[PDB]
Write a protein that binds this ligand. Structure first.
Ligand SMILES: [Zn+2]
Ligand SMILES: [Zn+2]
Ligand SMILES: [Zn+2]
Ligand SMILES: [Zn+2]
Ligand SMILES: [Zn+2]
Length: 1834
């Protein structure tokens, strides 16, 4: 066939091919002329050089070419990756991990010179000779081609014989060939399609071979292209063969970070431009306006079909989510059910860009800016799966912390390996000559044998030990022993699709008429009849082990000779089934015998799907233990031969399993019973479907399609009829009546359930539904009639009973003839048997035998941890084992496959016990690093400053890191029929690694190295951050007294003072904290994580108090200073130093004026004090001036001052511009490091130095009084200076994570952690990743840790906390509550009453604010919403209006000042919006009439009755008062439509008209645009109706509130025939309560209201309010009760209020002056809130007006007065801000009785929220309530 015809949809004759090795094997089998390259090399080594290739698809393909060439012709050709270039750090880390090029450069522009920088920073010379070169997508771009010309300088100089490019179709290719001809290179570009070379991806890219000119009269590129376009072979395997399974540890992890990321967390764009296009499409294809995949409301309110990765759908945008709906509807109406056909959408493209509904097996182009969507999974294409569509093989990949966008970059800007391999092989073949052969074979072969002979010894001597005890022989027949296992299986199997392969989902729900289990969170759109799940859950980790003990490992089949089958068919011939044919029988029996004979099935893995299953791989078949809940069994499947066409008669008949083994429930053994064969014998039978029952909307109708699928009916039952014998031959008695289960989803919502019948009593339930084939035309999909409905996987087949014809679908007909087909007849077989089967293994089982034989500089050797011996068959054996000598196996590139073929051995071994605890030699030699296990990272140089790196040290660091001992070593051999493989850990290497990462100190301590090994380690799915708890400080004895202070210590500061004394004393305590640096190494598949650690004990005196303002931290620290006085406990000293006995405090600037005044207030005069503010005090006093001083306190700005650093460098003997920086980053840290190295020498030399620096000399004590304030520049200052004891004081301790705890511990002196920049948050990583050298940013991606190595550091941080960190946080005081409740005055109460129902009418909750382009659509929003003024949401406005009456608070130009006078403005302004509505409705009708006439100028609609017009039918229906219109609402529509244009007829031109058409032209654009105008007009009609209905309601209630003759007259307008009466909240419909309760229940009042009404709306007219009762007119009733309460307090207390609304606070502050309660408002100034709070707390102003979110001590304050409940989103944040401020007043240090007051309104949303808070807060956290007592005071 032609290539285009073939690649449009996959050829059925090309064999299915998905293995990249088989791809390239076939490609080499194509051309046999490639050996000419072997010859023209003559023993040389080919020289490749890629540039910006991305993922080295070149080298992947070329390795596979070399392996293929050897496989066919027995000829070896080698090639040496001379150098690669790549710019992006994560890309080059990926390359270095997965390939290890010997040279890897930064940028191509540099490499036109004699040397360049490699990725590391080595600056090696450019190589100079290559043979083939490949540039890429990223370099071909005087600025545009900065890279392209830079690469051309390389090409011109070095003249490579072959050059290949790769890029998009739309590139300046002619200019490329011009630039090539500039330097004499023959170039020809051609475009080629990825789908044309073996892969079902669709990508077209443009290539061009190059070669130097004048090689011949021939033009080489033309012949090259002719050969390349010959190398075409279309796709034949669906993209479902390149996809990983859904429950796969790399995909389920991808689902889990999505859920976890959502668990941590607003950006609203308007898609109004494309919205009209979406509805236009829905209108055009006649699709409905439904949303059947995910019913989406807003950005993130959607709800998928429970199996659809819903946490991804929540994160998309509205356009994408809607386009998914439009796609599923287009794919519907074509007989195709999306979600059950395997296909893929790329939904980033706008609507109508693509035709869509393409060939299902194919996949669109996966551009870097893609948002793909796998249909049948319900989720995005995982990046690892986008890399396998580029031909890259993904098994042995190393990925370390890549995003999905960062990895989509790689997968999109890649080279399809088959395509580049074809281009290379044609290029090399055509340009085979002109190659500069070496042709010296034997001198090279000698070196080849030299390298092999030296490494064959090197691997054999790497293992020491093996004298450790061998352990008892294991037999593979561990069949050691009933249905308790089979029900442990049910209790352990999967219950929520989101569970995966080891997960527990709370609140499982199980259905009836079908057993579909799902979690309560992700379940309910395909909802169907649930009930909670009964059974309790066993962990699968615990189950699987009991299962493993039940299983053999190698099994074989005994029976099934030939000619036994030849009598198996005889009995079925005697029986009524019949044998259809003999050709198929021969072709089947043949391939069955070569699958059974000579095959030892080996155990591979266990599937934890909703049913547990075990899998056994052979050479030519597979075996599966199914372990069903009912009828567990074994099924055998035979692999069809690899070289078979897709439409093969053999391959087809070898698709379903071929043999069956019913596990005997009686028998306690797994393997037992008879074997039944599925003989291939297709059968023709005739059936009679009958449709009876109620008719239901069809599947398409339920989706809401509007074409011929507008309304279509299908039956609710189906009565199936089969012939007697034609029933008896089939095993299951399948004739009955099947009830449809529409809520129970399936393909086309088709789940029919068998009714319970007779004699099928104990048997699984049989379902009948539709199941598509994941590929192929709609007419492929059929009815399954099966016994299971589980969501299967690729390569798993459904065990079905009989299939039905493919032309049934659905209907509503009475009965019809249909053809059923069944093809597999099972027949008994007793001759089959399944049979299980001097092995050893050297478990060391002696943790000390290794430790004894361990020696220093033994890093070269691998201490043997395990050995084994197992009998294999040397025949039909595979090449992992090596005959004769140990072969090592490189784990990084072969470990997954290796350990996947050894699992049948590895899962009989016992777990390595005796190794969990760690013990080893002690007092080890310190600082003796290996410099082979742990190289010294190079010194980084600094010089607008760029982090430069030292090239010379970089090269040694490179070589050393390249040559490091692999911590685990695996070796295998097959000497004589007995395979022996061993595992060894390089323990001393781990210890040497951990030794290096532990910085040296001048300590008299010696570390101890140790090591441990833990089995069973499993990779960890994400959990949330661990919170860090601080221990209390009350359980200890209290220090007696300070014997100096004049004031007591309140009995809760004594218990902490004793704690500060005991540590600065440090009784006993050879060492306090043990700093532990661990290093690890993973052996994944076996599961061992072997970790070795170094411990250093350190003894340090001090801690962090971490206590909040209003606590006597200052008092307690002056106490600790007084106690240890004249007591010279600190022993050590630098040999040259100026140590004093003073103590130092570091405090911020505005808190320094405090501290000496508290010594003065307290004892004072018992020790000399010096405070220093400002630099010109350090100049003032010398060293002997500063002498004889006990306590010194410094402002933090002294370090931030730069004359301080000038003095520091002057005493450091540095140049005067050294240490002179304005940014204070990592560079200034080195400027400190060198200086501090200088200080020790300077002070070692040699007083009264006039201007000393604090950093030069040593203290008795340093106290960091605030640790979170100290800026990033001045923190480094306070981290250096030395002291005998270390104290940190802080109101807020920075204890949020490890990176925050480490900042404290560095001040302490501990070294609990090391930097890695892979542990912080995504935010925090960036602020440090801007300071990284370009090589460090690369080194971060190179190595990654285990998420257990972080948890252990978390544990060590917690252990640091529990020793050095205390916190005093438990009822201090009587905390009483006083719920004050309002009566509604109805002077402003009714003002409130109109708001909630006005907002109910307009149904607007919040003001949305987004990007509006349409000037006449955005203003209609800014005006409609304008009534909810000065606020964000309905709750906020309702609270503001229940606190105080006012239309709106931002505009103070007009002031109501009274309740009725405010109602006046309410009525006036609301009539104003009514007129605004009618006048927007004015201009809109005119524009509609004009656009209507725009059809008329063109002339009719091409027919008198071409179509009904939306606008026309809206007229003459909105133009009468007949029906579907308010009693009085619509009479005001005629007054506005007729005045423009009268009766329906004519009036084509408008009476005023400015622009007849805003308007290229389509004549359908304006048509459907007029339709949109009709819809908008209907909308506007609705708001008019609401506006007038609410107006009538409010004027009615204001009538009673006025209480006059009009009130009584319209009171007697009851209209209910009666004359106590309730009012409708929607309009004035005063009809009596007696009938009107039934009116509101029946949802229809007596009138011709107009809209349905709720019984909760009703109010009693006598219950509205009484007038003249209380003067609630001057201000809000809340404000006057506030005045009353604050009057009622005694004058001597203190009051604070919160004011949760700052807008309301402006009015509250003014109204408080009416009560004349002098107040502070906490505003009016910036940064002068310090004086705000110093006021009235130094001693005046009583009451404070807080903000409820705007560290200060409120100890003077006694009464909190909340003034209305706070409005907030989450209960967590509610309680956080609620216990906070409840904490601000009575935290500690208070000698009062705290009272909490609430001013709430009885009939108001404020109580509606208060009840919601109370009735839910007591359940969660079991929050402690406070006693409630009525405030009587004064
Ligand atoms: Zn779920
Ligand atoms: Zn159900
Ligand atoms: Zn070492
Ligand atoms: Zn009545
Ligand atoms: Zn009414």
């Amino acid at each position: 066939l032609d290539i285009k015809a073939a690649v449009r949809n996959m050829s059925d004759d090309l064999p299915p091919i998905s293995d990249i090795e088989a791809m390239f094997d076939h490609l080499v089998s194509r051309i046999p002329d490639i050996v000419e390259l072997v010859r023209q090399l003559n023993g040389r080594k080919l020289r490749v050089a890629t540039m910006c290739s991305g993922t080295e698809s070149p080298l992947l393909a070329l390795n596979m070419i070399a392996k293929a060439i050897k496989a066919q012709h027995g000829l070896t050709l080698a090639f040496e990756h001379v150098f690669s270039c790549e710019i992006e750090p994560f890309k080059q880390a990926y390359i270095e991990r997965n390939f290890t090029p010997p040279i890897l450069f930064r940028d191509v522009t540099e490499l036109g010179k004699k040397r360049a920088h490699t990725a590391y920073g080595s600056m090696v010379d450019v190589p100079g000779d290559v043979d083939i070169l490949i540039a890429g997508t990223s370099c071909v771009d005087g600025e545009s081609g900065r890279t392209f010309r830079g690469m051309l300088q390389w090409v011109k100089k070095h003249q490579p014989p072959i050059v290949i490019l790769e890029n998009v179709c739309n590139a300046p290719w002619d200019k490329v060939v011009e630039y090539f001809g500039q330097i004499d290179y023959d170039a020809q570009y051609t475009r080629l399609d990825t789908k044309e070379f073996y892969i079902p991806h669709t990508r077209t890219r443009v290539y061009l071979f190059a070669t130097p000119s004048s090689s011949e009269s021939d033009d080489l590129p033309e012949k090259w292209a002719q050969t390349v376009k010959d190398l075409r072979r279309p796709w034949s395997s669906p993209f479902e063969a390149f996809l990983l399974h859904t429950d796969d540890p790399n995909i389920h992890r991808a689902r889990l970070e999505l859920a976890s990321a959502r668990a941590q967390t607003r950006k609203t764009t308007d898609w109004n431009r494309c919205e009209s296009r979406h509805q236009r499409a829905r209108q055009d294809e006649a699709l409905g306006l439904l949303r059947p995949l995910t019913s989406w409301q807003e950005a993130g309110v959607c709800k998928g079909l429970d199996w659809t990765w819903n946490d991804w759908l929540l994160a998309q945008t509205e356009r994408v989510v809607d386009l998914l709906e439009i796609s599923t509807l287009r794919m519907a109406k074509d007989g195709i059910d999306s979600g059950f056909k395997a296909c893929i959408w790329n939904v980033s493209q706008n609507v109508d860009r693509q035709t869509g509904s393409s060939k299902t097996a194919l996949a669109p182009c996966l551009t870097p800016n893609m948002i793909p969507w796998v249909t049948i999974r319900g989720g995005p294409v995982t990046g690892r799966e986008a890399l396998a569509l580029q031909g890259i093989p993904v098994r042995e990949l190393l990925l370390t912390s890549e995003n999905e966008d960062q990895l989509a970059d790689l997968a999109g800007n890649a080279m399809t390996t088959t395509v580049v391999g074809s281009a290379m092989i044609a290029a090399l073949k055509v340009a085979c000559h002109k190659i500069t052969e070496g042709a010296n074979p034997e001198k090279e072969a000698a070196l080849i044998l030299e390298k092999e002979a030296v490494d064959d010894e090197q691997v054999a001597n790497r293992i020491i030990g093996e004298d450790y005890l061998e352990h008892h022989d294991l037999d593979l027949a561990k069949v050691t022993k009933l249905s308790e296992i089979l029900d442990l299986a049910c209790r352990s199997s999967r219950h929520c699709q989101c569970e995966g392969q080891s997960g527990t989902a709370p609140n499982i729900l199980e259905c009836q008429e079908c057993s579909y289990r799902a979690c309560k969170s992700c379940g309910g759109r395909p909802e169907h009849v649930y009930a909670p799940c009964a059974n309790q859950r066993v962990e699968p980790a615990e189950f699987e082990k009991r299962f493993k003990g039940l299983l053999p490992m190698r099994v074989r089949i005994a029976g099934l000779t030939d000619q036994c089958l030849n009598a198996v068919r005889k009995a079925a011939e005697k029986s009524n089934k019949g044998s259809v044919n003999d050709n198929d029988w021969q072709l089947w029996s043949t391939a069955l015998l070569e699958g059974i004979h000579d095959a030892e099935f080996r155990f591979r893995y266990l599937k934890r799907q909703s049913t547990w299953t075990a899998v056994y791989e052979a050479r030519r078949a597979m075996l599966s233990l199914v372990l069903r809940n009912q009828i567990p069994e074994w099924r055998l499947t035979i692999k069809a031969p690899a070289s078979e066409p897709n439409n093969s008669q053999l391959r087809a008949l070898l698709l379903h399993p071929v043999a069956r083994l019913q596990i005997d429930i009686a028998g306690q053994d797994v393997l037992c019973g008879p074997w039944e064969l599925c003989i291939p014998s297709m059968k023709t039978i005739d059936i009679e479907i009958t449709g009876k029952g109620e008719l239901l909307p069809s599947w398409q109708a339920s989706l809401g399609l509007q074409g011929p699928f507008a309304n279509t009916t299908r039956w609710s039952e189906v009565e199936i009829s089969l012939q007697a014998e034609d029933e008896n031959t089939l095993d299951r008695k399948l004739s009955g009546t099947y009830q449809l289960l529409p809520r129970c989803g399936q393909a086309m919502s088709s789940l029919h359930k068998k009714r319970p019948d007779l004699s099928d009593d104990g048997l699984p339930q049989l379902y009948f539904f539709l199941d598509p084939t994941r590929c192929g035309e709609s007419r492929e999909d059929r009815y399954v009639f099966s016994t299971s409905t589980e969501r299967l996987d690729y390569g798993t087949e459904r065990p079905v009973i009989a299939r039905l014809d493919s032309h049934w679908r659905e209907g509503n007909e009475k009965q019809r003839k249909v053809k059923l087909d069944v093809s597999g007849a099972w027949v008994k077989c007793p001759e089959a048997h399944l049979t299980a089967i001097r092995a050893t293994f050297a478990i060391p089982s002696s943790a000390s035998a290794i430790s004894a034989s361990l020696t220093t500089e033994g890093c070269s050797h691998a201490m043997a941890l395990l050995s084994c011996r197992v009998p294999l068959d040397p025949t039909h054996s595979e090449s992992m084992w090596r005959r004769g000598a140990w072969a090592e196996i490189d784990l990084s590139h072969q470990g997954n496959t290796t350990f996947a073929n050894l699992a049948w051995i590895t899962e009989r071994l016992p777990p390595l016990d005796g190794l969990k605890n760690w013990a080893h030699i002690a007092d080890d030699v310190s600082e003796h690093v290996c410099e082979r296990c742990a190289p010294r990272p190079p010194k980084i140089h600094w010089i607008t400053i760029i982090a430069f790196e030292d090239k010379l040290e970089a090269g040694q660091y490179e070589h050393a890191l390249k040559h490091r001992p692999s911590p685990f070593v695996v070796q295998l051999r097959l000497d004589q029929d007995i395979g022996s493989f061993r595992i060894g850990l390089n323990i001393v290497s781990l210890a040497h690694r951990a030794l290096s990462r532990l910085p040296p100190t001048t300590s008299e301590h010696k570390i101890s190295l140790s090591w441990r090994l833990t089995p069973g380690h499993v990779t960890e799915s994400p959990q949330p951050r661990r919170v860090f708890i601080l221990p209390s400080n009350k359980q200890d004895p209290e220090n007696s007294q300070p014997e100096a202070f004049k004031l007591p210590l309140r009995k809760e500061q004594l218990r902490s003072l004793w704690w500060m004394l005991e540590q600065e004393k440090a009784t006993g305590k050879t060492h306090t904290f043990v700093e532990e640096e661990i290093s690890e190494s993973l052996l994944p598949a076996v599961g061992w994580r072997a970790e070795g650690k170094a411990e250093r004990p350190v003894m340090v005196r001090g801690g962090v108090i971490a206590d909040q303002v209003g606590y006597g931290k200052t008092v307690i620290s002056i106490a600790l200073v007084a106690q240890t006085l004249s007591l010279p406990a600190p022993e050590p000293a630098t040999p040259g130093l100026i140590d004093l006995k003073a103590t130092l405090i570091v405090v911020p600037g505005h808190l320094s004026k405090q501290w000496p005044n508290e010594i003065a207030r307290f004892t004072g005069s018992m020790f000399k004090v010096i405070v220093i503010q400002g630099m010109k005090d350090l100049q003032e006093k010398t060293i002997a001036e500063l002498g004889k001083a006990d306590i010194i306190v410094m402002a933090s700005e002294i370090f931030e001052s730069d004359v301080y650093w000038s003095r520091l460098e002057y005493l450091s003997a540095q140049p005067r511009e050294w240490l002179h920086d304005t940014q204070g980053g990592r560079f200034f840290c080195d400027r400190l490091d060198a200086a501090m190295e200088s200080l020790v020498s300077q002070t070692k030399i040699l007083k009264l130095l006039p201007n000393p620096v604090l950093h030069m000399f040593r203290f008795r004590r340093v106290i960091a009084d605030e640790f979170t304030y100290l800026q990033k520049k001045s923190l480094a200052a306070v981290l250096r200076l030395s002291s005998s004891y270390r104290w940190i004081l802080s109101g807020t301790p920075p204890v949020s994570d490890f990176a925050a705890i480490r900042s404290i511990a560095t001040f302490m002196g501990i070294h609990l952690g090391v930097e890695d920049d892979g542990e912080g948050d995504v935010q925090y990583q960036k602020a440090r990743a801007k300071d990284q050298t370009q090589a460090e940013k690369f080194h971060a991606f190179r190595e990654v840790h285990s998420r257990a190595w972080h948890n252990r550091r978390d544990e060590l941080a917690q252990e640091f906390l529990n020793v050095f960190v205390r916190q005093n946080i438990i009822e201090d005081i009587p905390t009483v509550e006083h719920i004050h409740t309002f009566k509604l005055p109805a002077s402003e109460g009714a003002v409130y009453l109109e708001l909630e129902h006005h907002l109910q009418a307009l149904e607007m909750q919040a003001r949305k604010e987004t990007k509006f382009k349409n000037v006449s659509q955005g203003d209609r929003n800014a005006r409609l919403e304008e009534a909810l003024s000065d606020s964000k949401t309905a709750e906020e406005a309702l609270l503001k209006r229940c606190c105080h009456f006012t239309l709106d608070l931002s505009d103070k130009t007009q002031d109501a000042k009274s309740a009725q006078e405010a109602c006046d403005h309410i009525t006036s302004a609301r009539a104003r919006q009514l007129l605004a509505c009618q006048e927007d409705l004015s201009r809109s009708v005119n524009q509609a009439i004009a656009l209507h006439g725009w059809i008329k100028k063109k002339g009719g609609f091409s027919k008198n009755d071409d179509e009904r017009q939306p606008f026309a039918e809206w007229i003459a229906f909105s133009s009468n008062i007949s029906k579907h219109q308010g009693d009085i609402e619509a009479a005001r529509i005629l007054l506005k439509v007729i005045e423009k244009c009268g009766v329906k007829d004519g009036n084509i031109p408008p009476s005023p008209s400015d622009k007849q058409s805003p308007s290229g032209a389509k004549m359908d654009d304006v048509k459907w645009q007029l339709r949109e105008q009709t819809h908008l007009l209907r909308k506007l009609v609705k708001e008019l109706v609401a506006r007038v209905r609410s107006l009538r309601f409010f004027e009615v209630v204001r009538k009673i509130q006025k209480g006059k003759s009009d009130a009584q007259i319209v009171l007697e307008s009851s209209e209910c025939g009666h004359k106590e009466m309730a009012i409708l909240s929607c309009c004035g419909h005063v009809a009596c309560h007696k009938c009107m309760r039934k009116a509101a229940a029946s949802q229809r009042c007596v009138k011709s209201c107009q809209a349905a009404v709720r019984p909760t709306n009703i109010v009693k007219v006598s219950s509205l309010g009484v007038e003249g009762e209380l003067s609630s007119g001057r201000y809000g009733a809340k404000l006057e009760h506030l005045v009353n309460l604050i009057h009622s307090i005694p004058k001597n207390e203190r009051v604070l209020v919160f004011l949760q609304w700052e807008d309301l606070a402006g009015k509250v502050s003014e109204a408080l002056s009416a009560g004349r309660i002098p107040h502070v408002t906490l505003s009016g100034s910036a940064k002068s809130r310090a004086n705000t709070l110093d006021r009235f707390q130094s001693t005046s102003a009583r009451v404070l007006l807080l903000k409820m979110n705007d560290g200060s001590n409120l100890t003077t304050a006694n009464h909190a007065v909340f003034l209305g409940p706070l409005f907030t989103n989450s209960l967590f944040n509610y309680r956080a801000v609620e216990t906070q401020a409840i904490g601000r007043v009575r935290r500690y240090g208070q000698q009062k009785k705290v009272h909490i007051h609430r001013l709430l309104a009885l009939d108001t949303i404020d109580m509606t929220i208060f009840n919601a808070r109370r009735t839910e807060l007591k359940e969660k956290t079991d929050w402690e309530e406070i006693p409630q007592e009525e405030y009587k005071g004064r």
